[PDB]
Design a binder for this molecule. Structure first.
Ligand SMILES: COc1ccc(Oc2cc(N(C)CCOc3ccc(C[C@@H]4SC(=O)NC4=O)cc3)ncn2)cc1
Ligand SMILES: COc1ccc(Oc2cc(N(C)CCOc3ccc(C[C@@H]4SC(=O)NC4=O)cc3)ncn2)cc1
Lengths: 263, 261
């Protein structure tokens, strides 16, 4: 109605999402970048990985090093799913969707969000682990045997390009909401209300980027192009997950643990 | 802190609806005839059990076949309960060995709690509500399966008299999972801290949802005596079954759960 009210409503939505993102994700990009730019224990080879087991208490140990790193990543992704699920509840409209559509949106959205937020913890030379208490080098991850040596490298390649956009946590809170509210996920029952919510989130993202990054020509479009790129990264990751359970022998052992990590 | 506890209650109820397709509300609707679906098929003897083959969507002997049908239900329930447990705030952040231990020693307490939702004094819903198997038929089975469901029916009658609904049960089942006394837990204190918060939320939920029900919180917590007794008696029955039966193929999930330590 009144002049400026549309801008104000979009800024209020942006602020709400940022405040919720702070409540849901303790290690924000701001906190991560401070750590990366200078202290965490550095894991830079297999010997320092064994020494790192002492300095930090990792929760996933019950094998060969490449397998154990992978299972440590899977433990952390399960924790991330619970944080992202909590965040999703604060996106206006989400909890009023059909319950099956909520589950579907999270099922098919969490991996894109995981790799988006992992970029916040990465620089060109490695990644923060254990809530910022450790740092594992990119070179060490690349040195793992096939097929684990190329598990993290496409994530680093994405992150260096993505981080060059210099998004902050207020930008990312809205970007992550836009990814969750994707009306093209397989099996959704009511697509229209999801696209309606996403329309409002896209309006909020566009205004946030125009105000926060006025010098960054067409940043909104560039960020949508990245959303397209994350789809590719996730499809590649799922391919490797199918390699690790066929090619890499270790299958029907510990059925309860298999259950926690089914999907 | 009251708002946090209500938010926790709401979160657990939502996760419970997402994890368990056959809720108590849906089961009660079926048992009382509310639904717009054909009434469940009633199995009350051998002949009707046989017809249940064709009315409802390996072992040829009756007792074993009933027993194996219970085992496959538990396998399904374990999958649903594990999905629910991961939603309990703090659970997936525990040491992974302790996550496994909590599921190993908690799933059957939850299975029998939720079995009561599908029971009345005369029988129990089976196959997603498609069938109803009578308590008297289950009592008739040959030894060692004589009265093997009777402790479950006795518990359910008393438990259902508490009048809990799904929103109450969601918090109760979380309290069960987060039990710091399970054998072999490595880090008891983080589990007790979560259970403390769940108990606070359960107390508030019961006072708000059942304001007229005196000491319902205490009476619900006392039902763990009944539940642990059911589990110990069932483990003992399994030991008898090992002696009285020939080859007993067991699902890998149940063999892990029943593996001693
Ligand atoms: C000393 O004990 C230790 C043992 C191991 C160890 O390695 C690590 C590495 C690590 N990261 C590299 C940081 C997290 O990266 C991730 C990579 C991939 C995913 C996607 C997961 S994976 C899958 O299959 N499906 C998924 O969705 C998620 C996160 N995080 C934690 N531990 C360190 C210490
Ligand atoms: C039409 O063909 C049919 C074939 C079989 C048939 O019998 C039944 C009976 C039944 N209940 C009696 C209802 C479920 O009670 C249960 C009792 C015990 C358990 C625990 C299992 S047992 C074990 O040792 N460890 C376990 O964790 C689980 C559930 N549920 C499903 N099928 C009916 C029809």
């Amino acid at each position: 109605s009144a002049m400026g009210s549309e801008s104000a409503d979009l800024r209020a939505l942006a602020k709400h999402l940022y405040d919720s993102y702070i409540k849901s994700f303790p290690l924000t990009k701001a906190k991560a970048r401070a750590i990366l730019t200078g202290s965490p224990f550095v894991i830079y080879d297999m010997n320092s990985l064994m020494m790192g087991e002492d300095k930090i208490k990792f929760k996933h140990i019950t094998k060969e090093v490449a397998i154990r790193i992978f299972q440590g990543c899977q433990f952390r992704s399960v924790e991330a799913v619970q944080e992202i699920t909590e965040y999703a509840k604060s996106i206006p409209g989400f909890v009023n969707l059909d319950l099956n559509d909520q589950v579907t949106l999270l099922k098919y959205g969490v991996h894109e969000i995981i790799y988006t937020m992992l970029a916040s913890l990465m620089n060109k030379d490695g990644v923060l682990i254990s809530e910022g208490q450790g740092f594992m080098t990119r070179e060490f991850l690349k040195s793992l045997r096939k097929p684990f040596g190329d598990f993290m490298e496409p994530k680093f390649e994405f992150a260096v390009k993505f981080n060059a956009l210099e998004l902050d946590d207020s930008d990312l809170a809205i970007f992550i909401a836009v990814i969750i509210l994707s009306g093209d996920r397989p099996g959704l029952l009511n697509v229209k209300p999801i696209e309606d919510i996403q329309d409002n989130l896209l309006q909020a993202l566009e205004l946030q980027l125009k105000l926060n990054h006025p010098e960054s020509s067409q940043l909104f479009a560039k960020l949508l192009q990245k959303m397209t790129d994350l789809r590719q990264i996730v499809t590649e990751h799922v391919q490797l997950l199918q390699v690790i359970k066929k090619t890499e022998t270790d299958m029907s052992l510990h059925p309860l643990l298999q259950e926690i990590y089914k999907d």
